[PDB]
């Protein structure tokens, strides 16, 4: 007793919210519940794509190392995404995470040089701090202004152990020499589901400004800003975990009553 | 009934932070499943106010009838109800006792919060739900909450003197901050466990006593695994996503050892 146009909206909402590395499982659940593969393919096509761009899904392209991220910044319409490192275009199936059709592509050599020096120095940083990390660096014009967008993804999927986790960084550097405007979002998400459903969601906005020079010299400085900002974030997380554990948790339920012993139920009943 | 299994599987994957709003939608999506979902999907407990005796009570599906809820204090429905599901006068008396018992239990382990106990009649015995909600203080920088949902089943044997208890317990644990250091951080959700035991029903050891011991054990055992999962496991996962100190060539290399190994 709710409109079919609404039902698909809910189904779409559910899909977009699938925990990291559990898209399939959520999708199957949603499909079987809606019971209308016709509604799904229309009113939810938007959701499959949005989720992948939202989650910075890494994908292997055949004959290339290494992987590239599916973001909104690589979206070219059609169903094609850009790999700025290899300067190639490729097709993507959002349902089965498949990268077909490697196609040489021409980059706007406006920023090419700045982009390479970042993509280069960020590669090294990712390698150093993200065990299973991937990154993709874009260089494109936004409102007449040259922007460099660095995206980092790192995940650990262990469905057999009923837990999954993912880190996503998005750093935007709008470059207006002699200054650059830094704007970032850092996201963490962890899902544990052995005999329950426990999740950590956290994000941090970061905003900063810096003085620029030569492309190589400030690519290096960009990375330092990233390193510092992310370390502080991970530290803050670990510090907050500490506080949560030995302060606010202890304050919710005691471990034993103030009598340092288990409850005498006879006393309780008279 | 394969439908329900999907809904419940979905509920264990969608972020527990939006349990209430998601269940609302899930039911709209599959209205036939409503009655079933409402009884098998746990939600953060709400507090209502029994205006008659002036005391708070907790709300779940087991004291709901229609859109009204039964206060364990005045034994009446709110908003008032024509013909609502009640307990037999025999059971009501045990209920009122179980509420007093678990009220003390609450005080003993939580030093505050709210508890409510609802009993209902079964076939060869009875069932109960024990609810406890405790909130942390707005003095400290971190919001916290603890919801306990213990559902017990009692199957009395024909003799008396011995009975079989089935306990299904869920604890929902919610932690959250806007400390500028880490933006927003919400760590929430729940765990569920099962105990199943036979025990002596004497005068020195009645039903409430038997149920109590079971609850106490489970809650102590969960409090433990909670601490270990919330502040142990989920954190380690975080730390396995990113490392502050630059990754040491040893793990970098141990990792290549295993990556190469996984060749189809």
């Amino acid at each position: 007793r709710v409109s079919d146009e609404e039902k698909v909206r809910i189904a779409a909402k559910f899909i977009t919210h699938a925990p990291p590395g559990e898209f399939n499982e959520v999708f199957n659940d949603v499909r079987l519940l809606l019971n209308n593969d016709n509604l799904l393919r229309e009113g939810a096509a938007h959701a499959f794509a949005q989720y992948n761009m939202d989650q910075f899904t890494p994908v292997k392209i055949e004959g290339y190392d290494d992987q590239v991220l599916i973001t909104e910044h690589g979206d070219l319409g059609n169903g094609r995404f850009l790999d700025p490192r290899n300067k190639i275009s490729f097709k993507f199936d959002h349902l089965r995470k498949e990268a077909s059709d490697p196609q040489p592509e021409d980059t706007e050599s406006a920023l090419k040089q700045w982009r390479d020096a970042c993509d280069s120095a960020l590669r090294a940083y990712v390698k150093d701090h993200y065990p299973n990390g991937f990154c993709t660096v874009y260089g494109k014009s936004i409102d007449g202004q040259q922007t460099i967008i660095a995206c980092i993804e790192s995940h650990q999927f262990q469905p057999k152990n009923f837990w999954n986790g993912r880190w996503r960084s998005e750093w935007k550097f709008t470059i207006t020499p002699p200054t650059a405007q830094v704007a970032a979002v850092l996201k963490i998400q962890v899902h544990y589901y052995e005999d329950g459903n426990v999740q950590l969601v956290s994000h941090k906005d970061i905003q900063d400004s810096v003085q620029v020079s030569s492309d190589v010299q400030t690519a290096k400085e960009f990375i330092k800003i990233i390193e510092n900002a992310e370390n502080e974030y991970q530290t803050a997380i670990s510090e907050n975990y500490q506080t949560m554990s030995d302060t606010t948790f202890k304050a919710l339920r005691r471990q034993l009553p103030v009598t340092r012993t288990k409850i005498d139920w006879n006393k309780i009943l008279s | 009934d394969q439908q329900l299994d999907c809904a419940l599987d979905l509920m264990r994957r969608l972020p527990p932070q939006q349990i209430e709003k998601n269940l609302s939608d899930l039911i709209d999506l599959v209205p036939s499943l409503c009655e079933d979902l409402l009884s098998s999907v746990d939600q953060p407990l709400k507090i209502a106010r029994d205006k008659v005796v002036g005391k708070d009570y907790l709300l779940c599906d087991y004291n709901r009838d229609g859109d009204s809820y039964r206060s364990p204090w005045s034994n009446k429905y709110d908003p008032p109800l024509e013909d609502g599901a009640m307990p037999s006068a025999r059971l009501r008396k045990l209920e009122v006792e179980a509420n007093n018992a678990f009220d003390q239990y609450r005080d003993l382990y939580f030093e505050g919060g709210v508890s409510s106990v609802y009993l209902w009649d079964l076939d060869h015995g009875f069932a109960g739900v024990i609810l406890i909600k405790k909130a942390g203080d707005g003095s400290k920088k971190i919001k916290g909450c603890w919801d306990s949902i213990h559902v017990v089943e009692v199957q009395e044997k024909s003799s008396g003197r011995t009975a079989h208890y089935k306990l299904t317990s869920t604890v929902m644990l919610w932690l959250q901050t806007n400390k500028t250091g880490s933006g927003t951080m919400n760590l929430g959700g729940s765990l569920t466990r099962q105990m199943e035991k036979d025990e002596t029903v004497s005068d020195s050891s009645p039903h409430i006593a038997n149920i109590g011991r079971l609850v106490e054990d489970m809650e102590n055992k969960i409090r433990s695994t909670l601490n270990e999962i919330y502040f142990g496991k989920t954190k380690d996962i975080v730390n396995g996503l990113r490392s502050i100190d630059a990754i040491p060539d040893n793990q970098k290399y141990k990792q290549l050892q295993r990556e190469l190994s996984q060749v189809l």
């Binding site: 499982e25 199957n28 349902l95 469905p159 057999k160 | 419940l8 264990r12 409402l38 069932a127 089935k166």
Partner: peptide, 29 residues
Amino acid sequence: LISELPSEEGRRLEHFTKLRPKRNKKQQP
């Protein structure tokens, strides 16, 4: 067009709340 996607958890996730005692309401929600 279309598909039933491959999960790799092996075991179905088991829902403990199913086997809890049911309770008969005198009207539905």
